[PDB]
Amino acid sequence: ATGGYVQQATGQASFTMYSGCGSPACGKAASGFTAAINQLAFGSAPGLGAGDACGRCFALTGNHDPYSPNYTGPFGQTIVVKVTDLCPVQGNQEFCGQTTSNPTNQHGMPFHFDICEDTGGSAKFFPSGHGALTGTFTEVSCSQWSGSDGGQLWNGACLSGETAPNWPSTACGNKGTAPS
C-alpha cells in the first residue's frame, strides 16, 4: 500500500496477548475485542498516529503453538478483533519486526496480532498454558464485531477502517514509509 506497508486482507500471522489497550496508537480504544497489529501492516510508526489498519476487523484463528510444536490442540475459538493499536518493530523483534526488506518475523509470519487481554479477547483465543500461537487471519465486515468505540484521545484519532471495504482500500490512510 501507500508507504510500502504490507496490508493484506488475509494471510498467516502469529499471535500474542498484551495488557493496557485503553490509549492505543489509533487514538480511540474500543470496548469489544481489540488487537495491535505489527508496524509493517499497521501503516504508521510510533508517534505518527493512526495507520490504515485502524478500525478494520479481522477473524483470527490459532492452529499451532510454536513453542510447543508437539501440541495438537485444543486451540481457542476464532475471534473477531478490531485493530486499534500498533505493535512496533522497536522492542518487539521476535513478533513484530517485519520490514520491507525482511517481511517475516522470527516465526516466519508476515503479520502479527497482539490481542488485548483487558477486554476479553485473549481469554477466548488462547488456551490456558498456551499464550502465543500461529495461524490465520481474514478481514471481515465489522458487522461481525461486537463492541463500541471509545472517544477520540487526540486530534487525528481514527478508526474509520471500521466502515471500509477490505484491503485493498483506504480509510484512515498510512503515515510515512514502512520500516525497511
Ligand X SMILES: OC[C@H]1O[C@@H](O[C@H]2[C@H](O)[C@@H](O)[C@H](O[C@H]3[C@H](O)[C@@H](O)[C@H](O[C@H]4[C@H](O)[C@@H](O)[C@H](O[C@H]5[C@H](O)[C@@H](O)[C@@H](O)O[C@@H]5CO)O[C@@H]4CO)O[C@@H]3CO)O[C@@H]2CO)[C@H](O)[C@@H](O)[C@@H]1O
Ligand Y SMILES: OC[C@H]1O[C@@H](O[C@H]2[C@H](O)[C@@H](O)[C@H](O[C@H]3[C@H](O)[C@@H](O)[C@H](O[C@H]4[C@H](O)[C@@H](O)[C@H](O[C@H]5[C@H](O)[C@@H](O)[C@H](O)O[C@@H]5CO)O[C@@H]4CO)O[C@@H]3CO)O[C@@H]2CO)[C@H](O)[C@@H](O)[C@@H]1O
**Residue 65 near ligand X by CB under 6 A:** yes
3-state SS class at 155: coil
Question: 25 vs 81, which CB is nearer to ligand Y?
Answer: 25
Q: Which of residues 70 and 148 has its CB atom nearest to ligand X in the complex?
A: 70
The residues, any chain, with a CB within 8 Å of residue 40's CB and separated by 6 or more, are 5, 6, 89, 98, 99, 100, 103, 178, 179
**Residue 46 interacts with which of ligand Y, ligand X, none, CB < 5 to 8 Å by class:** ligand Y
For residues 39 and 14, give the distance between their C-alpha atoms in angstroms, rounded to a whole number.
Answer: 14
Which of ligand Y, ligand X, none sits in contact with 74, Cβ below 5 to 8 A by type?
Answer: none
Applying CB under 6 A, the residues found at the interface with ligand Y are: 18, 23-25, 27, 36, 46-49, 85-88, 92, 114, 153-156
Residue 123 is a binding residue for ligand X (CB under 6 A): no
129 interacts with, out of ligand Y, ligand X, none, CB within 5 to 8 A per kind:
ligand X
Amino acid identity of residue 144, one-letter, is Q
Provide DSSP, 19-47.
Answer: S--SS-TTS--BSS-EEEEEHHHHTS-TT
